[PDB]
């Protein structure tokens, strides 16, 4: 199973485009310093999958400095598995009310065929200014998944 | 001093590094004020402030006004905003934002108070919120930000 959630997830790259979010409403993963993380769900575009959940991950900022080397990552537990596709980039500027904002975008796949309810592990590394900040959290507001196939 | 006769365009803004301060908060709006210099050197005693509005919600917000008053000592003045209207959040696209420059002018340089009254709806449901800010930053910084 964990070689056929493995094969299935394998080489698969959901471009950001083809992902038709569900009004599900976003779920603020991380919010400190200016800088958050959004959740926002939607069905798996592609055939077969209802029993994948696409995360359309969202990294937003209001600070007055600038945000650089941004990586975020997650872990989830073995009876379901988790890939992260690169994100669209790693850095964010200070805000600019000339413009508007920006955003750097992530898309996360989560293979759950046991459908087991999910409990997702994040870390974020971070660079504002001159500290470099490591945040670690929880996150478990997921869609259950029994919907994942009609979101 | 009367702030009839005075506008700061918003491409003459310059961002100060004063962290911001978020007024309104709910329903995935948010409202932040950002303060600035007063790139006009006519006197020390303007504030500048640039005002962002936000949404995350899953549906458009509609018919926004934020309008704002002070005591009496002072006066404040809001240029139009950049619009009054924002999209429903999609991840796929970049963001969105409304803003305003609003201008606070404080000879006596008193503590500033200011009081909003924000107006909106999202589909049918109406909002009437007020709430007050008073976290400006002391006008004898006023001139160097």
Same mark, same amino acid.
């Given at each position: 199973?964990?070689?056929?959630?493995?094969?299935?997830?394998?080489?698969?790259?959901?471009?950001?485009?083809?992902?038709?979010?569900?009004?599900?409403?976003?779920?603020?993963?991380?919010?400190?310093?200016?800088?958050?993380?959004?959740?926002?769900?939607?069905?798996?575009?592609?055939?077969?999958?209802?029993?994948?959940? !696409?995360?359309?991950?969202?990294?937003?900022? @209001?600070?007055? &400095?600038?945000?650089?080397?941004?990586?975020?990552?997650?872990?989830?537990?073995?009876?379901?598995?988790?890939?992260? &596709?690169?994100?669209?980039?790693?850095?964010?500027?200070?805000?600019?009310?000339?413009?508007?904002?920006?955003?750097? @975008?992530?898309?996360?796949?989560?293979?759950?065929?046991?459908?087991?309810?999910?409990?997702?592990?994040?870390?974020?590394?971070?660079?504002?200014?001159?500290?470099?900040?490591?945040?670690?959290?929880? !996150?478990?507001?997921?869609?259950?998944?029994?919907?994942?196939?009609?979101?």
């Amino acid at each position: 199973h964990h070689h056929h959630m493995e094969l299935s997830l394998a080489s698969i790259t959901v471009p950001l485009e083809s992902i038709k979010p569900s009004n599900i409403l976003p779920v603020t993963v991380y919010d400190q310093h200016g800088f958050r993380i959004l959740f926002h769900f939607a069905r798996d575009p592609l055939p077969g999958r209802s029993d994948v959940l !696409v995360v359309v991950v969202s990294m937003l900022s @209001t600070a007055p &400095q600038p945000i650089r080397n941004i990586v975020f990552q997650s872990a989830v537990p073995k009876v379901m598995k988790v890939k992260l &596709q690169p994100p669209s980039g790693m850095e964010l500027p200070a805000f600019n009310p000339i413009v508007h904002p920006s955003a750097i @975008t992530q898309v996360l796949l989560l293979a759950n065929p046991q459908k087991e309810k999910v409990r997702l592990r994040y870390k974020l590394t971070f660079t504002m200014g001159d500290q470099t900040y490591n945040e670690m959290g929880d !996150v478990d507001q997921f869609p259950p998944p029994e919907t994942w196939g009609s979101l």
